[PDB]
């Protein structure tokens, strides 16, 4: 029969004698109540990775075949809940009662199943929406040193986007079990929880459950797709998932490579990040975009994992630690960060104003090292554009407001600049309805004369 016995147990890795018909990726059950995943089939033994606490298994334990590839239960019954990489709820509150499951080792959709990135996406931060734009369906990478202003990006993005018909999946990976509460509660303070799902895999749980932690969330967002939607997925960190895969591979008796990291890492990431797609009209016209996070030692962007990761994503936002303390928040480097989709998915008001502003800020950064009358004006304009882009925590600004102040910035209109922003917002909120409605409706800049009298009237006040 499809039965076997275990003759080696250690660190969540077991070796099984028997189990002739076990397929690769198949689940296999123990009598203790915790499942296992097969990753190797030698001549006479099978390599099993245990999917939970391992204090109960003993040599000679019987192990039984189940007969199904990796699954995640998905559906609208999970919105608002907090769940493990498997379908077991974390916050209690009873079982989730799902019926359907997805096989998440399925093939990624291919060519002619895809379309160009077209609809804009906004986080409410002037630093990201303007200089380094993001489009719905893009994969944009956030890499940086520890404690430099990362998680705020995702949390403020989910907070701002409550106005839309979107669905968000957020995952915390390898973090201490309690660490998530400050996140989970803060969403509920602004109400952002009522349309999202949170997935957690703590350090208390075994390392292998980190290796499936980012796989399941993209499958949840996948099942929400294949119908017309707009879906986001965030993994709070992948580097610990890479370490978990490394230390999973090592005990399986598989030789190492360039580092302790095995050479399959690229393949793994290719299996993950490529799962996203912006499907065409004949497929459903959805959108699944991801915001991966990656950490490197001492901010060394030239290391193995950073360079490996960059080769797959559609861009990168580089958070630099030495600008963090200088007073530029978020500390996005306008010179090094890149976005590949560019102006494909962006409202047409921003094209007329700040389509190329990024090259201006990069040139100002390059000229700073040399500067340490045309050059004087360039330096003044660069200092001001650096000053404008700053934002604070949990105070997003809607997409309809950014273009109006960017127009004043990019049309030649320092101690008081930041308050000039807020007072200008007040002046608009009380008078400029005739411009704001037009921006809301046609997504194009209104008459330049009227904007000019409005701006000059403010400046006179």
């Amino acid at each position: 029969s499809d039965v076997g016995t275990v003759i080696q147990v250690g660190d969540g890795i077991a070796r099984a004698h028997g189990l002739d018909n076990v397929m690769s990726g198949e689940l296999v059950e123990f009598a203790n109540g915790v499942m296992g995943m097969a990753l190797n089939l030698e001549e006479n033994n099978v390599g099993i990775v245990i999917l939970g606490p391992y204090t109960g298994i003993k040599e000679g334990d019987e192990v039984r075949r189940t007969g199904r590839i990796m699954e995640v239960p998905v559906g609208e019954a999970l919105i608002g809940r907090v769940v493990n990489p498997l379908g077991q709820p974390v916050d209690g509150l009873g079982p989730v009662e799902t019926t359907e499951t997805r096989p998440i080792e399925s093939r990624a959709p291919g060519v002619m199943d895809r379309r160009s990135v077209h609809e804009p996406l906004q986080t409410g931060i002037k630093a990201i929406d303007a200089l380094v734009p993001i489009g719905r369906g893009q994969r944009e990478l956030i890499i940086g040193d520890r404690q430099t202003g990362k998680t705020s990006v995702a949390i403020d993005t989910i907070i701002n986007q409550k106005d839309q018909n979107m669905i968000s999946i957020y995952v915390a990976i390898g973090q201490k079990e309690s660490t998530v509460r400050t996140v989970v509660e803060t969403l509920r303070k602004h109400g952002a929880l009522d349309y999202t799902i949170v997935v957690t895999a703590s350090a208390s749980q075994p390392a292998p459950l980190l290796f499936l932690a980012p796989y399941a969330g993209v499958a949840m967002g996948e099942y929400f797709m294949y119908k017309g939607k707009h879906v986001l997925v965030v993994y709070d960190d992948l580097s610990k998932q890479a370490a978990a895969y490394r230390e999973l591979s090592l005990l399986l008796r598989r030789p190492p490579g360039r580092e302790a990291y095995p050479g399959d890492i690229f393949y793994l990431h290719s299996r993950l990040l490529e799962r996203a797609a912006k499907l065409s009209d004949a497929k459903g016209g959805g959108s699944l975009t991801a915001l991966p996070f990656v950490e490197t030692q001492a901010g060394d962007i030239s290391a193995y994992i950073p360079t490996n990761v960059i080769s797959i994503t559609d861009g990168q936002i580089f958070l630099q630690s030495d600008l963090f303390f200088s007073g530029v928040r978020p500390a996005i480097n306008a010179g090094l960060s890149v976005s590949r989709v560019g102006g494909a998915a962006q409202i047409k008001a921003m094209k007329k104003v700040a389509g190329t502003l990024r090259l201006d800020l990069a040139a100002y950064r390059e000229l700073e090292a040399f500067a340490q009358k045309a050059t004087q004006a360039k330096l003044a304009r660069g200092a001001r554009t650096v000053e404008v882009l700053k934002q604070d925590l949990h105070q997003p600004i809607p997409v309809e407001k950014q273009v109006l102040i960017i127009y004043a910035l990019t049309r030649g209109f320092v101690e008081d600049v930041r308050r000039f922003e807020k007072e200008f917002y007040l002046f608009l909120d009380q008078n400029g309805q005739h411009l704001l409605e037009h921006i809301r409706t046609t997504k194009d800049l209104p008459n330049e004369d009227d904007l000019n009298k409005a701006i000059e009237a403010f400046k006179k006040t």
Binding site: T55, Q175, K176, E177, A203, S204, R246, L250, E259, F325
Partner: protein, 469 residues
């Protein structure tokens, strides 16, 4: 129903059993033997199971010296984890890692309840999170990185920067008057300090509210791991079943992970990048995920991690940042400038540095200080090569201030009275937040370079300068 020993490799023993009697992980084994011939030696030994390697064998790690283990001897399995006393009876006493008394003052009978060491971490429905300030009176710490009750505070430093000095200063300033149960686990420190603090506690009358276990350097690799767990299994009971706030102090918890690297190469595992065991993250997580607060009480633990060199990129200390709630970093290069404590202002951070929890006047000065220090850090190469006189007037004025701020970060500790002509001084939070304002606005910045060294409040600076002429 008994075991045998067939293979010995130092810290590792490869015990063997019979069918159906295989122990579980963390189970305890006991070996006793008396000399049958004059060529043998008498030793009583205890062992901890770690791996199962088939063919009716399990790997175990020795808890004491393994010298003289003749092959073929008998082994006893207790069937239960290592059990250590806990509760009221453990206050004022001292034990080793195995749990027996080592203070020689007396025994502890079986009527005192004892629990297993290893238990799973609490579920998400049991945890709680709240933020509130724990105060120490240290100028450099209380401003740029205030501590949080029930959180984790980490100390980072090289092979001697003053970690133990800071730990003992915190104990002298907090642990006695906090009102909570105190536990000090002497993990991997010098035995001289371990027996010095015993006098320091008994002669001062604080020993009536303290519990301690020791695992110092002389002990074999198996013992150096479980000292932290044996220390934590008592603070857990003090938090839960008695509803008391608990403070826990650990000095060299890093000696945990290093110990693993000693034994892993003998257990039979493949090596990691720099030879570590390929379980660093998971084992450290299983260690630090039990130091948590709950809805019934709070556990606050201050720990220090031994950095193997002046390189923070080493995986073992780098992966510690996944658990800390407040961070303090030390470096030799600031210690050598004559400034104590040599806490780096641009790498120590805390979650409590938020404007709704500390007020505007606190966040403003903290951010201003960090911003002003960043520029002076950046000007390093050019001031070093050619001189401070090269820069412009607006940069020269900035150069005039950062070193004074760094000097003002110094303060005389209470344990430094034996090395300094003045005793330790105290500066409250309301005073440390106030102090930097005067220097930032130029109220006292014109004083000379050395007057800001080894000072308390800002008023003492001016009288010390007057004493200097």
């Amino acid at each position: 129903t008994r075991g045998r020993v067939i293979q010995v490799m130092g810290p590792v023993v490869d015990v063997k059993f019979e069918n159906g009697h295989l122990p579980a992980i963390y189970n305890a084994l006991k070996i006793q033997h008396k000399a049958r011939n004059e060529n043998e030696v008498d030793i009583d030994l205890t062992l901890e199971v770690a791996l199962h390697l088939g063919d009716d064998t399990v790997r175990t790690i020795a808890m004491a010296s393994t010298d003289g283990l003749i092959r073929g001897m008998e082994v006893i399995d207790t069937g239960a984890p290592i059990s250590v006393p806990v509760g009221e009876v453990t206050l004022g006493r001292v034990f080793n890692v195995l749990g027996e008394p080592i203070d020689l003052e007396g025994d502890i009978p079986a009527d005192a309840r004892r629990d297993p060491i290893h238990r799973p971490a609490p579920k998400f429905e049991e945890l709680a999170t709240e933020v509130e300030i724990l105060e120490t009176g240290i100028k450099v710490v209380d401003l740029l990185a205030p501590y949080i009750k029930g959180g984790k505070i980490g100390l980072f430093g090289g092979a001697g920067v003053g970690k133990t000095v800071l730990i003992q200063e915190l104990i002298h300033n907090i642990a006695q008057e906090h009102g909570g149960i105190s536990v000090f686990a002497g993990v991997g420190d010098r035995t001289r300090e371990g027996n010095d603090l015993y006098h320091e506690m008994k002669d001062s009358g604080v020993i009536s509210k303290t519990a301690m276990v020791f695992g110092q350097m002389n002990e074999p690799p198996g013992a150096r791991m479980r000292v932290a767990l044996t220390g934590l299994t008592m603070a857990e009971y003090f938090r839960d079943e008695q509803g008391q706030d608990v403070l826990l102090f650990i000095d060299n918890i890093f000696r945990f992970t290093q110990a693993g690297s000693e034994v892993s190469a003998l257990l039979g595992r493949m090596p990691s990048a720099v030879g570590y065991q390929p379980t660093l993250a998971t084992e450290m997580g299983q260690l630090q995920e039990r130091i948590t607060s709950t809805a019934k009480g709070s556990i606050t633990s201050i720990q220090a991690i031994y950095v193997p060199a002046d390189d923070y990129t080493d995986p073992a200390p780098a992966t510690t940042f996944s658990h800390l709630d407040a961070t303090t970093n030390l470096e030799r290069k600031l210690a050598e400038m004559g400034i104590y404590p040599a806490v780096d202002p641009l790498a120590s951070t805390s979650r409590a540095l938020a404007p709704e929890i500390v007020g505007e006047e606190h966040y403003q000065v903290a951010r201003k200080v960090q911003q002003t220090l960043q520029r002076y850090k950046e000007l390093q190469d050019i001031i070093a090569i050619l001189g401070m006189d090269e820069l412009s007037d607006e940069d020269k004025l900035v150069v005039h201030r950062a070193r004074r701020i760094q000097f003002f970060l110094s303060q005389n500790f209470h344990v430094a009275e034996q090395f300094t002509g003045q005793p330790g001084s105290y500066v409250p939070v309301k005073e440390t937040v106030r102090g930097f304002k005067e220097i930032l606005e130029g109220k006292y910045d014109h004083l000379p370079e050395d007057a800001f060294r080894l000072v308390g409040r800002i008023e003492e600076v001016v009288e010390k300068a007057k004493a200097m002429g």
